[PDB]
């Protein structure tokens, strides 16, 4: 969602612990805490303008400016306006066609919690589809389907699992990529608008094959129309079906009706996984109160922690839905994990409490 590294003691990390980011994120803010007036006893940033000039290797830190690396379309604002802390920010574009990395550092005085800064950008795993109908030339040499690809002012386009759609429209069109046209809508994870250049992130888990969304952009007195639709594929959900109803659009691995068991036994529902590379969906369907907040804040195994904090993988999308009183929370995962980890979520209805433990292996 958003990456933040605390260099004050108010957050999780305190500065009076390192920040490593190995991800591929797209058009997002990066906040950096730095107190200056309050107290800077030899407290510096290395170099002084880190977001403008930043070194390349910790074994030999040489001076290198941002414009001499290979990054595309960035934004570096350095605000010193907040009365509590000072902020440093930068935005990342996905059009980067290489894997580049850098290092920054910070020094203290009093054994004052020295922290290290390491960030590496990844070229987007899937591919992106550009359509620059507006007259504006780009040297990115991407896949661009211009005016000609429309069949009588309409464009039908299917998206594989996890692709991005790019649309250049300097003209202001409302309800863009949020008003579906059929009975169900093609729910996107991320829709953002910079320089009115549209972006649609295709989710990995959908419900019905007949879902769609629209945008009615205009160009040279002509109303063109783009319709999105997913390449459908039904996937099982690893987890436990607790709701008694059988007519559902979701398919669970483990299943048990929590309403028909006895009150004397609070049984569990364990789930284990062991593959080299992962691409599965994990969740549960609980008719009762789900505690804690799953799956963004799962319960620690044998304490409340963040989900991404234990898996150490940025590619974790979250999906939610309900069918009457049935509450269905889940999440997807892609990529090998660093170390074998575990976590639990809990479902509770009236005088019944079931626990769903999940274990994910590294090898």
């Amino acid at each position, epitope marked *: 969602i958003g990456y933040k590294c605390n260099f004050s003691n108010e957050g999780v990390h305190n500065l009076k612990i390192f920040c490593t980011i190995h991800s591929y994120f797209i058009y997002d803010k990066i906040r950096l805490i730095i107190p200056k007036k309050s107290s800077s006893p030899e407290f510096k940033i290395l170099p002084e303008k880190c977001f403008q000039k930043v070194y390349t290797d910790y074994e030999n830190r040489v001076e290198t400016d941002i414009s001499e690396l290979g990054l595309i379309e960035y934004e570096i604002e350095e605000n010193d306006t907040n009365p509590n802390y000072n902020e440093r920010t930068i935005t990342i574009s996905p059009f980067s066609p290489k894997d580049i990395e850098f290092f920054c550092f910070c020094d203290n005085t009093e054994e004052g919690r020295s922290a290290m800064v390491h960030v590496r950008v990844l070229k987007y795993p899937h591919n992106i589809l550009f359509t620059n109908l507006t007259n504006d030339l780009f040297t990115y040499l991407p896949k661009t*389907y211009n*005016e000609s*690809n429309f069949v*009588s002012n309409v*464009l039908e386009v*299917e998206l594989n699992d996890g692709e991005l759609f790019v649309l250049a429209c300097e003209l202001i069109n409302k309800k863009c990529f949020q008003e579906g046209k059929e009975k169900a809508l093609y729910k996107s994870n991320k829709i953002i608008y910079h320089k009115n250049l549209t972006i649609f992130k295709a989710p990995f888990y959908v419900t019905s*094959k*007949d879902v769609n969304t629209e945008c009615t952009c205009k160009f040279k007195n002509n109303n063109y129309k783009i319709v999105l*639709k997913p390449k*459908y594929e039904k996937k099982v959900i690893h987890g436990c079906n607790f709701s008694s109803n059988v007519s559902s659009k979701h398919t669970f691995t483990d299943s048990l009706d929590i309403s028909l068991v006895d009150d004397s036994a609070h049984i569990s529902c364990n789930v284990h996984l062991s593959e080299p590379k992962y691409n599965h969906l994990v969740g549960l369907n609980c008719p009762g109160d789900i505690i804690p907040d799953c799956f963004f804040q799962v319960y620690q195994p044998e304490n409340i922690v963040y989900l991404d904090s234990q898996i150490n993988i940025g590619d974790i999308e979250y999906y939610e839905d309900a069918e009457g009183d049935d509450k269905i929370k889940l999440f997807g995962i892609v990529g090998s994990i660093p170390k074998t980890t575990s976590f639990t979520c809990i479902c509770k209805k009236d005088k019944k409490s079931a626990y769903m433990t999940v274990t994910i292996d590294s090898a």
Partner: antibody
Amino acid sequence: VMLVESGGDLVKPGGSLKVSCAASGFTFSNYAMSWVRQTPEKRLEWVATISSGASYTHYPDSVKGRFTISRDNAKNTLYLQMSSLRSEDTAMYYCGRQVNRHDRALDAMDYWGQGTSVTVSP
Amino acid sequence: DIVMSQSPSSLAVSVGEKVTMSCKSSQSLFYSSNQKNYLAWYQQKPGQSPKLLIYWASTRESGVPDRFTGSGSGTDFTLTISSVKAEDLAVYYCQQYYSYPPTFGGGTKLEIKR
């Protein structure tokens, strides 16, 4: 490149029939498919086309509703469900393949099938 | 909703002379940006499947002899062959693909001089 049809059989006026079309020599999921029929007057006419991902489907206004196009990429097969047939619907049916050299949803057919004869007479 | 008027219907030509065919169109078939005419010509050999010959109403496909040459623009379209062979006795249809639905012509049979 090979395209085998199957299912040609007579049916009483108003009945239904399902036909198939197998593919060989290319990746099925990368190309759009279509069907074309030929009257006894050797006059050609388009009947239905379906996209690669089997989401966007188009029919002509004459046969809308009764004809249902469908594809199964796992088996490399193309299906067409005809319902409530009439005297007019009797013809020879081919499953041509749309060309994707141009990234347009509508294009010409490079390779055609051999055909299979359906009959409506009672 | 697109009328493709093919003429003539029959065509008795000698063995090796220049033959000319026409395909009339009820509307313009030309994208000004791409500068290409949306039309295609086919060949249905006797008792066989129809095969594509000329797309974009000008260019040939891989596997088509040089004798064939498509021509025309806008609505008036012409198809010209040079040195006719002997099994070229097919019925040639012209299809449009500017807008749905793709309509076809009535075809033109090829009678051989004898």
